Specification:
Blueprint lengths: L1 H10 L15 H23 L5 E5 L5 E10 L2 E10 L23 E2 L3 E2 L5 H8 L5 H23 L6 E2 L2
Antiparallel strand pairs: 1-2, 2-3, 3-6, 4-5
PDB class: ligase
Keywords: UFM1 conjugation, UFMylation pathway component, Infantile Encephalopathy
Assembly: monomeric
Length: about 170
């Protein structure tokens, strides 16, 4: 299927996660966080080697609240947006809800608080793969493709400003 090959191409060099543990699961959550951070840092290294280093993430010490930035390049202009999410108690079955709060009110494919609305195919894809997908997969399969639709539309409408010009 086209959907399966599209997912395969996006995820193939992202480390797979193993531990089926959420934020209240103590030593098992510590283990899941080691997996999450190793998957994220490999995805960032892969992105840098593809001239597509497009986000940073950090967490609180408990790994239950995540925050950082994403970047989007369009017509030689770079846009930067703050991102955040909490880890659901039923993670990794339940995918976190990434928010881009500065864009709240500007995007139809968004809920209150700037929580992005992914197409209806995302949740079933996540559900099919539990507990193998983690935060790197959420970024690569979820936020990344959403930015590639919604940011060009805001630029076309003329209602966001770039952070810097490209080189």
């Amino acid at each position: 299927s086209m959907a399966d090959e599209a997912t395969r191409r996006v995820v193939s060099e992202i480390p797979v996660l193993k531990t089926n543990a959420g934020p209240r699961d103590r030593e098992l959550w510590v283990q899941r966080l080691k997996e999450e951070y190793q998957s994220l840092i490999r995805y960032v290294e892969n992105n840098k080697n593809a001239d597509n280093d497009w986000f940073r993430l950090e967490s609180n010490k408990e790994g239950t609240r995540w925050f950082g930035k994403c970047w989007y390049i369009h017509d030689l202009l770079k846009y930067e947006f703050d991102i955040e999410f909490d880890i659901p108690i039923t993670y990794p079955t339940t995918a976190p809800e990434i928010a881009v709060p500065e864009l709240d009110g500007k995007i139809a494919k968004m809920y209150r608080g700037g929580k992005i609305c992914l197409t209806d195919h995302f949740k079933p894809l996540w559900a099919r793969n539990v507990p193998k997908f983690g935060l790197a997969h959420l970024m690569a399969l979820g936020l990344g493709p959403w930015l590639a639709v919604e940011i060009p539309d805001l630029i076309q409408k003329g209602v966001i400003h770039h952070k810097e010009k490209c080189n």
